[PDB]
Amino acid sequence: MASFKLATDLPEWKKLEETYKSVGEKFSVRDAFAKDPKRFEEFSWIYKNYDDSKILFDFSKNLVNKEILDQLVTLAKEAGVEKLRDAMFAGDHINTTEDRAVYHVALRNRALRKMPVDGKDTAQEVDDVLKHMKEFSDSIRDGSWTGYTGKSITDVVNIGIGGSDLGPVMVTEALKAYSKPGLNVHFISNIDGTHTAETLKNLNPETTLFLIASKTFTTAETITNATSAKNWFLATAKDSKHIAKHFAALSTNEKEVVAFGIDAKNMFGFESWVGGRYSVWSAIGLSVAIYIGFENFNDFLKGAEAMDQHFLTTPLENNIPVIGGLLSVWYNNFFGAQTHLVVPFDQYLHRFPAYLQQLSMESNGKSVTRANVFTNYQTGTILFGEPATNAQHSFFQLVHQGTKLIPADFILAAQSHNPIEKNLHQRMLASNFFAQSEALMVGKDEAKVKAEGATGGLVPHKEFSGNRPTTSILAQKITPATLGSLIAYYEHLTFTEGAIWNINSFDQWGVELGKVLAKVIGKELDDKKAVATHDASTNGLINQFKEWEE
């Protein structure tokens, strides 16, 4: 049960409202640096990973100072962020609406700490699945696992959707430098038949392995796609006895896996307390272990584990994911900014914003608190992004000169996996990282526009307000361990937001509804008869579709 009903019941909330009016709304970052020669030192933190690599989190270009941050920390104390966090790590059923533990942190428990659910340690059970993943992925990679004609596997196709898709997509893209020629990964997720047809068109059934990724193993899109892949395989392989060399399952539901025709020996299990958007650390990450090797996957887990330990053991005022979450609340609930931009200065990380968009919005897009009352304030932000430098040429126009405050996170690795031309491209990339956050802060006033040659009516069009906030995250290199720590940072930032708003960050009743909505209309699409069973728009759309379909 909750210790308070609404975030607005916390006494510091109205104090933050007063501080916003007096100090926050018109905050000058330029003035803040001028007033405080140690501002960069005070509002940046170096995170040290388990492997002694480092990530610099620089929050000093945000609309924040000592007073504001101190009050946000007080708000986090009043909200019981630490109590709820400790309950999560203790295995308590803090997913109240589904009565489930929330234990993705147990998936990366490589230290084998005691981490119990329902009073029973999970460490060995998690480790045993990882050992199965290591054995299987090693056998795919070294060629000892062969297809039905005796050939080594060359292509691995993950079939799944949502949390069973986007992690595998984003992480294999992000860590692609660690892959090897001749062993490729592909993804089928959309029910749109295009996804099946285009992905399989050049693949060989003899050398293709399918992973059917589904927590429930009942999702309509995934089972339908999996059946289509089975039909494609059997069109060449003919006999269903060959399925055991080409189909594995990543799931919690052994009975449904076996009923689908997959061998239980080829099932990689996980538990109900793994949320889909928190699941790439589990068996769902098997495509990652195959693509880059289990040891790299394990280093990825250990990076998450190190960030978990930072989040668990650090006082709030120096707790990096807490600080990021507090700033999000500040912008969302006091400035009224509805969005959060994440920009990787890194092409491999091109799907990182989409992954965070699921993690963040599906967790915190809620309107009811843990006291089971409706909110009277804003909850989850709309998260979006694209990689830089491309984004600088497109929607950065609005970030710089529009009418909306868009808090932004910029991410750069100091070292490239592809340092071509003795790092000529990498130095250019880096210079854009520094210069863009600098310009968003400093702006360009009327006098400077005039000095640069504009006169008359042109002048205001070329001005920049400045005081547009950024967070800069500088890693040494995007290794598996670094990426593990970066995802976990956003996981625990998301945790902090939800704890302050007092929402359940771990259910998703809108996604659960979506998975049962379509069946009724699907049955109506089995013929060409006009329908009148819905509202007039739904009827009109269905009936126009029936006139235009094949």
Ligand X SMILES: O=C(O)[C@@H](O)[C@H](O)[C@H](O)COP(=O)(O)O
Please give the annotated binding residues for D-glucose 6-phosphate, written as ranges.
163-164, 214-219, 358, 362, 393, 515
Q: Which of 54, 515, 534, 546 is catalytic?
A: 515
Compare residues 245 and 351 and give the one whose CB is closer to its own copies.
Answer: 351
Instruction: Answer yes or no: 93 catalytic.
Output: no
User: How does strand 267-269 pair with strand 54-58?
Assistant: unpaired
Compare residues 81 and 101 and give the one whose CB is closer to ligand X.
Answer: 101
When binding is defined by CB under 6 A, the residue of 53, 97, 216, 378 that contacts ligand X is 216
Say how many CA atoms lie within 13 Å of 280 toward its Cβ: 29
- Listed in sequence order, the DSSP H helices in 251-395 are 254-259, 286-292, 294-313, 320-329, 352-364
Beta-strand (E) ranges in 173-242?
Answer: 184-188, 208-213
Six-digit token string for 513: 């509804």
Stretch that binds ligand X, among 12-20, 124-132, 154-162, 518-526 (CB under 6 A): 154-162
Give the x/- contact pattern for ligand X in 259-278, rule: CB under 6 A. Answer: -----------------xx-
When binding is defined by CB under 8 A, the residue of 11, 37, 150, 315 that contacts its own copies is 37
Give the x/- contact pattern for ligand X in 275-294, rule: CB under 6 A. Answer: -xx-----------------
Please tell me whether residue 519 binds ligand X under the rule CB under 6 A. Answer: no
Please tell me whether residue 197 binds ligand A1IIC under the rule CB under 6 A. Answer: yes
Cα(519)–Cα(103) distance, rounded to whole angstroms?
A: 32
Instruction: Answer yes or no: 310 catalytic.
Output: no
Please tell me whether residue 165 binds its own copies under the rule CB under 8 A. Answer: yes
CA 411 to chain CA centroid, nearest Å: 14
Q: How far is the CB of 415 from ligand A1IIC (least distance, A)?
A: 15
When binding is defined by CB under 8 A, the residue of 57, 278, 345, 490 that contacts its own copies is 345
Cα(384)–Cα(373) distance, rounded to whole angstroms?
A: 29
Phi, psi of 455 (to 5 degrees): -130, 160
Strand partners, 211: 158, 248
Compare residues 147 and 163 and give the one whose CB is closer to ligand X.
Answer: 163
Q: Would you call 189 exposed, middle or buried from its count of C-beta atoms within 10 A (0-12, 13-18, 19+)?
A: buried
Compare residues 163 and 205 and give the one whose CB is closer to ligand X.
Answer: 163
Give the x/- contact pattern for its own copies in 429-468, rule: CB under 8 A. Answer: xxxxxxxxxxx-xx-x-----------xxxxxxxxxx---
C-alpha distance from residue 397 to each of 315, 346, 390, 436, 464 (Å) = 38, 20, 12, 12, 11
Instruction: Answer yes or no: 120 catalytic.
Output: no
Partner in contact with 90, chosen from ligand X, its own copies, ligand A1IIC, none, beta carbon below 5 to 8 Å by kind? none
Please tell me whether residue 496 binds ligand A1IIC under the rule CB under 6 A. Answer: no
The residue count for binding ligand A1IIC (CB under 6 A) is 8
The residue count for binding ligand X (CB under 6 A) is 18
Q: Would you call 338 exposed, middle or buried from its count of C-beta atoms within 10 A (0-12, 13-18, 19+)?
A: middle
Q: How far is the CB of 231 from ligand A1IIC (least distance, A)?
A: 5
Q: Which of 12, 206, 362, 497 is catalytic?
A: 362
Place of tokens 């995934």: 222
User: Do residues 12 and 4 lie in contact, with contact meaning Cβ atoms separated by under 8 Å?
Assistant: no
Give the x/- contact pattern for its own copies in 495-514, rule: CB under 8 A. Answer: ---------x--xxxxx-xx
Compare residues 74 and 339 and give the one whose CB is closer to its own copies.
Answer: 339
Find all residues with CB under 8 Å of 122, minimum gap 6, and list them.
91, 103, 106, 109, 115, 116, 271
User: How does strand 120-121 pair with strand 116-117?
Assistant: antiparallel
Compare residues 197 and 264 and give the one whose CB is closer to its own copies.
Answer: 197
Interface of this chain with its own copies, residues 358 to 377, rule: CB under 8 A? 358, 361-362, 364-368, 372-375, 377
Q: Is the dihedral of CA 141, 143, 148, 154 positive or negative?
A: positive
Cα(490)–Cα(497) distance, rounded to whole angstroms?
A: 10
Interface of this chain with ligand A1IIC, residues 393 to 452, rule: CB under 6 A? 420-421
Which residues form the catalytic set? 362, 393, 515
Footprint on this chain of ligand A1IIC (rule: CB under 6 A): 196-197, 200, 228, 231-232, 420-421
